[PDB]
């Protein structure tokens, strides 16, 4: 390289053997992405069939206990462990895999290896984009999934008491974590969360409208009703009538796109902005900084017994959520709340 | 290189991007008004 | 924050709208 002799060495041989066409691309990033992702998926799929949560959360979270797919989960370590990484060699387990499983240490193991797998996947995208030389907007858009992953699996437990409040790897466990933010954090009323949900539903808008519009303003290219074969992989001409699309959306919606490039980039822009703002919101939640109470509305509700609103209904439902959460979701608090102190309405 | 600068540049933004920016600020105000008001 | 919200919302509206308007008329002045 650089018109100098460049005698081939171990690095050169490794690069030449690594960046080449295969069924699965290895490259340099495969030194981390393949083992880390393999370990993460293996640990999770092992946890949803084997790992009992009876000693971590005191629950059932695998098929070995009779759970189904949703209720099966790789469960978080106990809050008494704090923010320990729970090494199998470390003081928690000290080389004993069998009781390292009962400690919930594979939660931290799989979360760590999955973070490194996300890093390796982004590095694989970057390495492929370097190998065959086009812009890495896939990695630019992929910057948001890793932001979500960090902000909800590491930032939130590190801000809170420990990994126990972190989400567990499993669909019903994610549902538990979601209702946990609904009750404790009022995550629906969080501004950054509304930023994110607006961005994601707008991403669904752009994806659906772009696919439908492209498939509905197509040129002829036909003499056959199956328009899929109307496209040729090697052609330098448009396949769908964009000017017709612009007129249709200008007369239907009032505004329309005048550029394919800006259209596609805004399609990229909406979900990455939504996920990044959601990540910032859960980062704000990580230190018990919520959009929970509207001060003026709660004041006027306090000095007005008739002033009922949907916001106050949500607030009251959230302390009801938390009052029912504490006892059966926080064993390490051993909150033996009696039946009478539980808030409830008439009848039911 | 010389006394005038070679990076003498004009910045441009069409009215479509005006619409994007102004609606962004307006809906940001819609979103955050009840929060700064509290 | 009854009227601190007023001044904050006011400046949050003002600074980007004046900025965007200035650069837009810079664009539109040159044809």
């Amino acid at each position: 390289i650089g018109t100098y002799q460049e005698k081939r060495t171990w690095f050169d041989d490794a690069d030449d053997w690594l960046r080449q066409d295969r069924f699965v691309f290895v490259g340099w990033s495969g030194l981390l992405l393949l083992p880390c992702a393999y370990f993460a998926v293996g640990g999770w799929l092992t946890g949803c069939t084997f790992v009992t949560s009876w000693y971590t959360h005191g629950l059932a979270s695998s098929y070995i206990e009779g759970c189904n797919f949703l209720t099966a989960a790789v469960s978080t370590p106990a809050n008494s462990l704090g923010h320990s990484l729970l090494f199998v060699w470390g003081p928690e387990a000290q080389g004993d895999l069998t009781r390292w499983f009962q400690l919930g240490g594979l939660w931290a193991f799989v979360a760590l290896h999955g973070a490194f797998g996300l890093i390796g996947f982004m590095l694989r995208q970057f390495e492929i984009a370097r190998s065959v030389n086009l812009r890495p907007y896939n990695a630019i858009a992929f910057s948001a999934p890793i932001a979500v992953f960090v902000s909800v699996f590491l930032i939130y437990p590190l801000g809170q008491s420990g990994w126990f409040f972190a989400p567990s790897f499993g669909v019903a466990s994610i549902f538990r974590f979601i209702l946990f933010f609904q009750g404790f954090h009022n995550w629906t009323l969080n501004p950054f969360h509304m930023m994110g949900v607006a961005g994601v539903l707008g991403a669904a808008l752009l994806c659906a409208i772009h696919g439908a519009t492209v498939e509905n303003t197509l040129f002829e290219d036909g003499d056959g009703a199956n328009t899929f074969r109307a496209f040729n992989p090697t052609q330098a001409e448009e396949t769908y009538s964009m000017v017709t699309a612009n007129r249709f959306w200008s007369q239907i919606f009032g505004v329309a796109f005048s550029n394919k490039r800006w259209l596609h980039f805004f399609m990229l822009f909406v979900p990455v902005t939504g996920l990044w703002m959601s990540a910032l919101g859960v980062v704000g939640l990580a230190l018990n900084l919520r959009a929970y109470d509207f001060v003026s509305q709660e004041i006027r509700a306090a000095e007005d017994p008739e002033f009922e609103t949907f916001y106050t209904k949500n607030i009251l439902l959230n302390e009801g959520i938390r009052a029912w959460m504490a006892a059966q979701d926080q064993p390490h608090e051993k909150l033996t709340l009696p039946e009478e102190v539980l808030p409830r309405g008439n009848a039911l | 290189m010389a006394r005038p600068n070679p990076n003498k540049q004009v910045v441009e933004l069409n009215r479509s991007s005006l619409y994007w920016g102004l609606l962004l600020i307006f809906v940001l105000a819609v979103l955050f008004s009840s929060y700064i008001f509290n | 924050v009854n009227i601190l919200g007023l001044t904050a919302t006011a400046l949050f509206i003002i600074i980007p709208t004046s900025f965007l308007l200035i650069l837009y008329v810079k664009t539109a002045a040159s044809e």
Binding site: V243, G254, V255 | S16, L23, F26, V30, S33 | T9
Partner: peptide, 30 residues
């Protein structure tokens, strides 16, 4: 006082929707 601000900024939002719909940049066929 807050109701005036809410109403004014929301009617401004819908008015600039109207402005972006009708008084937009006309695209060119060239």
């Amino acid at each position: 006082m807050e109701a005036l601000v809410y109403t004014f900024l929301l009617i401004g939002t819908l008015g600039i929707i109207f402005f972006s719909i009708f008084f937009r940049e006309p695209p060119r066929i060239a």
